[PDB]
Amino acid sequence: PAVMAQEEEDVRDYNLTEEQKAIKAKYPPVNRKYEYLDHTADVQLHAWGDTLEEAFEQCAMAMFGYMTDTGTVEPLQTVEVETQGDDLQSLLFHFLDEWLYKFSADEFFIPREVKVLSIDQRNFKLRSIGWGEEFSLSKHPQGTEVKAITYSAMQVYNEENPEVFVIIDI
Amino acid sequence: MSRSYNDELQFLEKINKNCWRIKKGFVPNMQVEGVFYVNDALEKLMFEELRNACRGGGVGGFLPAMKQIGNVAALPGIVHRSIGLPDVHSGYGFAIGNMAAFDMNDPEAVVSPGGVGFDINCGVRLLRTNLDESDVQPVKEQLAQAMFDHIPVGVGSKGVIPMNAKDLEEALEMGVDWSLREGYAWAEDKEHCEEYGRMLQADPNKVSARAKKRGLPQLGTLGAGNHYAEIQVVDEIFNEYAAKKMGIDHKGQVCVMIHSGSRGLGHQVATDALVAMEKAMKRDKIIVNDRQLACARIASPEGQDYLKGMAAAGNYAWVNRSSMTFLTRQAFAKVFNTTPDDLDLHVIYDVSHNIAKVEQHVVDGKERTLLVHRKGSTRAFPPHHPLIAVDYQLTGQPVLIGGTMGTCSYVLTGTEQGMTETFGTTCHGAGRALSRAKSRRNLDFQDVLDKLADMGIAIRVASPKLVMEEAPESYKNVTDVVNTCHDAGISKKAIKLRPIAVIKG
Ligand SMILES: Nc1nc2c(ncn2[C@@H]2O[C@H](COP(=O)(O)CP(=O)(O)OP(=O)(O)O)[C@@H](O)[C@H]2O)c(=O)[nH]1
Ligand SMILES: [Mn+2]
Ligand SMILES: [Mn+2]
Ligand SMILES: [Mn+2]
């Protein structure tokens, strides 16, 4: 029951259609443990969880939640993302970047949910999966395009209530 | 950020009415001082950011622009000063509105991709027409809709003109030359484009496969964020000679300002180089105060590979803005049942603000070859400079300054004092006063849409209930920015324009 959010809640409103609203009512809401914090030029993702794995997966879901209303995405396909870094910060960087790439090329995949299956903290390696479908302007509302992940003010806290702070370029 | 605010001010000194000094010690290892140009109204915003960006003694927060200016002043090989321009505000490595120049004959000089930015060669193109406000007012909504229908905007949009991998490979090498060969640009466009719309050292082999896969579907798209295509009306002419060379005849003339960059191809090029440099900063023994400032010696293989891919991403951005120009011309031709040539829809200028350039400058009486980083700031070369298009040799180089969709925009020209104090660098816009997160909370989308309507400005945006994130109050007063540059002598005002229709992604 620890209150990790630093700001009062503020859901972004994507202008759902009746059909988009109906696709969301059809599925179990995804638990949200993230928020969009202040940064003069872009945005700071703040995500948390009970494990480092959950803090990571919520950060990815935060990133996708800035592009569209992920509640309107149907779990029609599953995609895998494995990556590595030299430390927790670069692992987090490459993890978010690999997921961003899944959305920006090839199959243009948008996850309704992301789950980190493992973080190997000795090699700084990660296994994750996401379920969703191909992003479509006829199906999904337009939020903001994410250009890139940055290291600006990146913070990874790996203690009892893990949380991360990431600035992304928008 | 563990110092008290008053302890931070111990490193800050006002130099003159419009300039502050950041003394060494503000952050570790500063090689030169930092400066930022602000008048009284912009000074308050800048110091509030210093106080509030990392207010708490706990976790979270971000780095204020002043700290970033100092971090950049610690980069090896920097000369003169790390310079914040009047629109400066916190970015992600360099500050937004931050210039730094490095001596290419210093073997320790570095190039920082993460400081040039992910939107490589993002820039502004201004077009003119022979239409007047009175010709557009009757069909303002129709024209706003025609722009929106022709120009793909927002996340997930794809280019309407078909492109294959080979076309992209040529566009990366040729820049606007490709658009000309294929019939999407006029010869006059290239003549009034910075660099003539092509950086010759571009090497498509230095652009990764991932960058090419991201870029292909997005070539010919506006993007999202603060990118825009705005129909404007000339409101004031400060320099009749400058206006004449630019084709601006009278107040009331209709122009179009387009702002976009190198899209996913450029974002990826920057990411790839950023990754390659973390892997390489051990060899050359490079220390930085901020991981996002990862860099390499200019002469290293990583540095050269980045510069060549950066140039290719620059060529992509010029191709993208030409596509926006072509589509804008199609929209005007349809609404006014006249060919684009019969509407005099020519390019006044195209200038970029996220790029590193090799330039000749004088440092302490000696002429030097510098690698000039401009993150969110513009080249503004002076009158009689040889590297300016012929039409602007006597006026000085045009600079295109977007304000907001609900205030105004300006055109400026470069000055000799600017060439001397800032290496020919001026502002690129108003800059932000409120984050998007703070705008989402403190402002209502309908209030913003009504205010625009009460001003007679037509609008078409991809996400209408997020438009408060682009509200005019979210940005600095652009007139304070331009007046500070003007009074400082680094830029000279030329034109003032007012928005009447805007499409945003
Ligand atoms: N004429 C207009 N200017 C605008 C508008 N919206 C924003 N801006 C101005 O444009 C200026 C330039 O903004 P930036 O290039 O820094 C935003 P951008 O997404 O392009 O940054 P990158 O991530 O580097 O691509 C900004 O400070 C604002 O003052 C607009 O709707 N119309
Ligand atoms: Mn940005
Ligand atoms: Mn841009
Ligand atoms: Mn820009």
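^ manganese (II) ion complex. DSSP finds 17 helices and 19 strands in chain B. The first strand of chain B starts at residue 12 and ends at 16.
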